[PDB]
Mur ligase middle domain protein
Amino acid sequence: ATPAGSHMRLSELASYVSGKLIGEDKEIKVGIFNTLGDANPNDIVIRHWIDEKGVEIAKNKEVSALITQNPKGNSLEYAKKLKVPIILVNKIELASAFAIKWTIKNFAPNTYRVVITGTNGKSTTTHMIYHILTHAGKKAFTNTDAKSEFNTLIDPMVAKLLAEKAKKENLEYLVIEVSEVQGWLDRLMKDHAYLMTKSINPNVVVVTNVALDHIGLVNSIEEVFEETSGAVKALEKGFAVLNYDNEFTRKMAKLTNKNVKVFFYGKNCPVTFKSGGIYVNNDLFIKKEELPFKSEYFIQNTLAAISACLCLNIPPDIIKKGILTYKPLKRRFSILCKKPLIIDDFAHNPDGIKMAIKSAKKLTKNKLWVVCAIRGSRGKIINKLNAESLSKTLKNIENYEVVITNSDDVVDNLNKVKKEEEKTFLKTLEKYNINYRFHKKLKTALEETLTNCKKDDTILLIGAQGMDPASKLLKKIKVIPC
Ligand SMILES: [Mg+2]
């Protein structure tokens, strides 16, 4: 069980988190689950690893207990002498999950709760739902904003941030993004989505889609489906909000438990997009020009957010006010310029690349330029599948030009394109008879594209870390602002 109150025994805490207590047992006062850098007296700190310096800082900060998987050097004996309790765990996600459960129970128990997962769209959908609720004046907590995506059990950040806000506000809603496929040291943390959803005990689970990505952690879309479905199996009550247009999210309906209602959104559903607008129960809800220059994914994410909020009994006019004032995250089909139309999108897996190209073509008057940064240091397979998606999506589209780059000039060591990655990407384009130009440097790719393009063309920039710097480079070479 999960205790209520601001005390527990060290031995009880160790058992709660699947750990072993190092040091003498004691009834401790508990503050919140925190990081070492921010810890207040009596806080409990969960950390992947600690060293003797961390033990000393914990003592100075009056931390009640340190929970860790790797006590480096002389940490254990040093902590025993300083009387800093160490709880050794093997599976740190169990400590983070307990920290979330305990924080909810003790600081925000009277809340409605939504979990959002999926391969693409879970951050935007989380952000949209949070925005609808807070724009309506509701008090809510979320673990994702424009700067951060704390969607895992690998650290205590969810428990820390939740506690900090719950002490200051009477929260009514928790809006929690959950990683569907999560790694640790390039190894799959199986059942992460199940465990993290269970720790929230949500009223609503949203699954945006199932798509191939995280090659190396997984390698089949079936496995992505299995791991993602853990969020739905975790749901005890309430509503499963599922994308009807994705085959694998549709299959999750059969996995819902006894007292769970499936709520589908998508084509020929109660919440749907058709003839340029969003409809709810056959009423025109959001109109075409209320969604200017928006992508396929933006629309699907909006359908998901509407659906989740309807399942929370938010009145439709409240939902609409939120949608119309939503401020999107960075590089989500971001319009940087209108003459020429420059679109900046962080597409990075086959589905996202396909979506971005098709959405850009829909808005394209004349020539479509696609500038794509190879996904460096992520493996040959994802780059092959990405080039395959780019090639298959473009092969029937008229009047395009492909510009490929390594972004060697702007990426760090962790994102450098490896020779085998560049090779599989470019050879895939050639297999599909896609003409292309290639530049090692992003700046070269952008300068040449913007020089040769015309004012009625569209320029689509796609890529992850390799394309992140494009906005600043376009300001640098004085393309932006237009
Ligand atoms: Mg998106």
